Amino acid sequence: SNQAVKQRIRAIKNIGKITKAMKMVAASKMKNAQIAVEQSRGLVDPFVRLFGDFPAVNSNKSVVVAVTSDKGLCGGLNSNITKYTRATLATTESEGKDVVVVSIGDKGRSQLTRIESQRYQLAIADTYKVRVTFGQASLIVEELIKHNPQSYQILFNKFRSAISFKPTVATILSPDLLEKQLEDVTGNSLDAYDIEASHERSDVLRDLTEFHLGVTLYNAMLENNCSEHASRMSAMENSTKSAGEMLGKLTLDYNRKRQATITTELIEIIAGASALM
Amino acid sequence: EAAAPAGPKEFTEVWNKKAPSTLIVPEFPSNYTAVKAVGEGQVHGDAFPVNFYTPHSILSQAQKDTVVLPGVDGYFGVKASHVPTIAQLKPGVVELHSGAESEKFFVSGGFAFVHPNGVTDICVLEAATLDQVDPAAVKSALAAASAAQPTDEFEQAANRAAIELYSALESAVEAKA
Amino acid sequence: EILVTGIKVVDLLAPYQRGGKIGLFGGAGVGKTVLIMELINNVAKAHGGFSVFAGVGERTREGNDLYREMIESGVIKLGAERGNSKCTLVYGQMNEPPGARARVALTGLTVAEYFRDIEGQDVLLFVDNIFRFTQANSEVSALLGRIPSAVGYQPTLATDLGGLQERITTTTKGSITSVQAVYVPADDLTDPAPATTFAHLDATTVLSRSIAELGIYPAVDPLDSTSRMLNPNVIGAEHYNVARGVQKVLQDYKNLQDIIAILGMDELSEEDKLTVARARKIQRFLSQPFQVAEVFTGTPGKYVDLADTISGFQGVLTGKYDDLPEMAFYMVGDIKEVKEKADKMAKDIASRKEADNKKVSEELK
Amino acid sequence: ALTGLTVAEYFRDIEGQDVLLFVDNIFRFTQANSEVSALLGRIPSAVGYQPTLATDLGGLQERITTTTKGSITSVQAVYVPADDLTDPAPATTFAHLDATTVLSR
Amino acid sequence: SIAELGIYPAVDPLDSTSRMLNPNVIGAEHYNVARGVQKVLQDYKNLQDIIA
Amino acid sequence: ILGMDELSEEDKLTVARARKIQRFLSQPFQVAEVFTGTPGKYVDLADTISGF
Amino acid sequence: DVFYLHSRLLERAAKLSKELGGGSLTAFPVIETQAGDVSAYIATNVISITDGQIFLETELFYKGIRPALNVGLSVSRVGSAAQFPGMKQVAGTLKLELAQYREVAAFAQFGSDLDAATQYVLERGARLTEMLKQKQFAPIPIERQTVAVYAATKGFLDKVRVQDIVAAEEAVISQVNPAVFKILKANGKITPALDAHLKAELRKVKLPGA
Amino acid sequence: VGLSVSRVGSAAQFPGMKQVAGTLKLELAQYREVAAFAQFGSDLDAATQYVLERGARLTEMLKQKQFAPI
Amino acid sequence: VGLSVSRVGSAAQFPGMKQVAGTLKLELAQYREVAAFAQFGSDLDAATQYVLERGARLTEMLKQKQFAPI
Amino acid sequence: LVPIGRGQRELIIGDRQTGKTAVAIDAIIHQKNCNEQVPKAQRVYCVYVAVGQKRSTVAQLVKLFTQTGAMRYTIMVSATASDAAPLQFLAPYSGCAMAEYFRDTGKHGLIIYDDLSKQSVAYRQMSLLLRRPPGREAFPG
């Protein structure tokens, strides 16, 4: 009757307190994990300066990884890159080739094993519990070069700002399969570089492409972690707004029920007293 | 042969054919990089821009005139307009030069590119300068490394990397002028 | 026996008995006059007997509008051809004192009961605002020297309402199909005068204010309207299973109404987002344009057969129309018109670049 | 409150001044008139107030006006019971209020 | 709500009160362990919001 | 949640104006000068509109 | 008998027949609500008596939108046929566009995302909202309202900024020659002979700013 | 099922049903205290997933038609 | 502490207490504003941690056993 | 889950159209199915009291109980909505007195007071018109 609305008010009030605390928690996490995102942006520059950027390559095998989140109050991030994953994957699979879809974060294994299920071989999680390190991303890249595809698509949300998260695809051509072929311009463009390695160019390109996969995978999950924090900071602001709006309507409903309660109890007392007096 | 012109602007039209018009086109990492390799410039004299990178820290994006890198065929100096190279670095000391002033970082490996537009890029994984490393544990680490040698291939490759890095670090700590 | 009305939500979720009592519960502006006018438009034309409209405590402008529409449509003829008229109007509208509004339903019942008993006919009886009978009895009851019952009504609410409503009965010598609008006083279904009326009816059609505020018309609450005809042994198992599946999807969406509000749809499970999508499709698909609402809405009315309703809601339940958008289901007749509206909704976004319209050298034509 | 308003009305009508009239907690005026109405055996209105609520407030508030001789301006402290602005006493007081000065901590 | 958890007897561990819950009467071991049980149960009742 | 660092100057002229506006609403009263020392100020209407 | 109190009063507002003189009486009852509760007793009594409603929202009245007409809730189903034609020619499209304006109402980019293909419905519904704002004690003749909603609906004001549509409306009413007002008032509809001259006179108006 | 109580419990039902319905009364209670966490779906250790995947079977078992007693 | 008022206030208390409890009620109000953050694991910006430790010790300082006034 | 006993009062409570009459009816039908299987002393004689229901519902229930054969063991006490308030007030007592014959003669009875909240309403009307003072929701004390 009139106690259920008061306990629902007491529910939504500390739900709003919870989400107001969670917004500042995610905001402090976004502020602390911004400098690492700014530092890791440097090392992805020389590899796309050297190897270029060729997303629409015709390959035989491609490992596509979608870097999702771990906990799921982000509010429209892990489904937006699932949409972007299928949108960039239908673009680049019309050669009759095999495609391996991977997800980093266990909110992507819940969203990717029902839309592309039989092409889903690997699921990685818990990468944001302590922090994101380069040895962790190098091990993840080692399980990515367990199989040897001709491309590595990395789907992640680039932390452009605290408001805007542009989803970014990044591609890594494996060396002898696609990289030595996709650089030929009347000869080659890589032949301008004087290889100063121990063994031949076919091995220094192998080391360079594995290191480029590790570098952009580390930067991808770091950018996606910062976008997770900055999207949770906005989703919890929306939850405070909604649980203040719901609380404001439910307060008026409780006031109407309270006024009607005193009126009906008083009318009952007057109707009892008018039968006797 | 260049009969397949892949790229970011060629990806956009195939994405406008096969992916729907509900979503804006995804970004690419070449949209965030203002400096390329073949687009000429950046030298303008005797200096040339350096890019000393670790995965966790940007160590220098200033403009130096001499860069000393520890390549696997030995040390080599990079002056203003070097030949374009891709130099695999061994453990050694990278030395930056601004003139009278110098920065001497000891790196752990990695690569170093010189590009046809005169820019250079040093891509290491851990670059600790020489006051941050102690000379007491490098000899303890080499004595714990070069003595116990497993004949297994993975452990002996790790041991070869250990004795190479610790020997270069021992030869680098007392060779400060 | 079923009585098909051409309304999708009525024929699907709470079908009307052919000789039963029907209630249209409503909250002052939700559309129980538009619904009863559409039931007059759809049912009384296909009927073979006489209609008796009892206007109890409603607007006099509405009685004049119904009189002019029934003269124009030919079911009321004037002068010498008056014997070929098929409707009797009995009007006790809200300008009358509470003694007149308390007994004008009895006059409508008497005119209907003569056709049922003596004439042996099958009668239709539409009573607009049977609440006004109860309200008039509560108005006169304070001056008869009675102690009031609950919230302010007369002590004899249930027995007066019972003595009225038990005269409306399909007997062995004639049938009355009674459609009674019931008014809930302050959108309170727990008010004693509609709560007493709920036990007298075979099919309640509870119209809701929130469904009307969503723009859905007729604003029938699907999880509050019931009927005794929704039974698998009387309307067949296919229709019954479709109605129960639609009610299950709507109840599962109503269970998620608080998580979607305070968290958004992005935190729902993948199985529940499909439930929300199918429920937002079926709750636009329950809405329907009316032939009596076309004068102020502009869209032409849609009469929908029963098999089209079952065949449409089968397709939306099984998942055959996850391609089409949610607004393609809104205010359309059948499942064909959903596809023929999703065509027009995607011709039109391709009609952003069709031409530049200019009419030149025209001023001296 | 009628006593204080009469002392203000002499300054309005006879002196021809612009007098101020401060009513501390007009809700207590409403509550006292509700208690007087309840002691006289009258049936209470909605939530517990007097049936004469709008007219007992209006008998006070309509004498606070500007005339051709002078004006009475009134600053009334308003208490809101259970912080309900839709309670009958603040909702009936707010139909006469020409301004509102919120003082906050 | 305690009996809806299957716990019987469904005594509210917080809302139940006695005059004997006094360290001068039942002893400072019994009183302190009862106050500690009520403290940890009130702490869990405050955490039951953020758990859900 | 962010600070003065991420405020635009278009959203910092509003801060620098609103702070001195909410200062300028304050005013010393004549009836408080017997215990606050500073004298009271009577501000005209035209002076208020001009000064704001 | 508090329903009978208002039904006695409001049923006397009628339109009499031709054998009773043909006169009319139009009622405008005013009901005040508490906190926007229109499900109250007297509110729902007079709603179930009167023909339509004019819901004046308290949220739009403090956002400067005056008159604060709740366009989603306020209906009028008796004077819908008794509308000035020409205003019936444009205002149906106006109400349809304000209907599909309330499909993105206050979640343009406030909630999660912005489409930028439905930026047009937002930056047109804001123009149709600022068109209907109107200052107090200044009623407009209907022939000067249908021309203003013609300029707001046919697209003659989309390049005007939202801050100056209230000045653009009075500039349209001042700069268009007053013959079209007399023709639209006498003919009672925007004729096909009139919309060409109206689009002629609507493309030579000096909309300020922009 | 969380509000429908009877005073007798045992000693007033079928002795065959008494052996079987205790594992029903317990596992529906296991289903009800889990299903208030059905907004996230973390499926903790395949145990909170399993108890709802049995309790949904029990609630679907308990349904029956009308005018057809068993 | 948030719902307890004294209209006579600080004008009728101990002047030794008047200079020290004035900081106390402001610290407790700041602790009440941030009291939702207390049951969080990821530690905050260390300005709210300072008040969340300070007020949580100040609320322990206001405890008192029965029938032993100070 | 809610096992009944043979002398136990069990309240079926819910909102409108939530299946309370269905549970009571299926109980009566199951007593018909069990009465043709047990030896003459565990046989259960149902009594259905319809308080305040309309007469079409009672006629439909009589048609159901005759077309399934449950009317051989069932009595139906029917004070409908058209009846007076003391008739609906007194019909659960009439049904209980008719069902107490089987309880007092060694047999086993089953009594369903359908719409006891309508018998309370009829009692409220009957006592308010006798000018007895009203109480909670104007019910008698």
Ligand SMILES: Nc1ncnc2c1ncn2[C@@H]1O[C@H](COP(=O)(O)OP(=O)(O)OP(=O)(O)O)[C@@H](O)[C@H]1O
């Ligand atoms: N086990 C069941 N399976 C399917 N339908 C059922 C079942 N039980 C009840 N119903 C349906 O629910 C509707 C309401 O049934 P019932 O009359 O038993 O409820 P009620 O509470 O007695 O209704 P009222 O309150 O109007 O008397 C009926 O139309 C019936 O068909």
Ligand SMILES: Nc1ncnc2c1ncn2[C@@H]1O[C@H](COP(=O)(O)OP(=O)(O)O)[C@@H](O)[C@H]1O
């Ligand atoms: N089927 C419908 N289509 C369009 N509008 C409707 C429909 N039903 C109701 N409405 C709107 O709701 C209002 C309901 O008025 P009315 O039919 O008199 O209901 P009530 O008698 O409950 O007040 C009408 O003004 C109408 O604009």
Ligand SMILES: [Mg+2]
């Ligand atoms: Mg009506």
Ligand SMILES: [Mg+2]
């Ligand atoms: Mg029943």
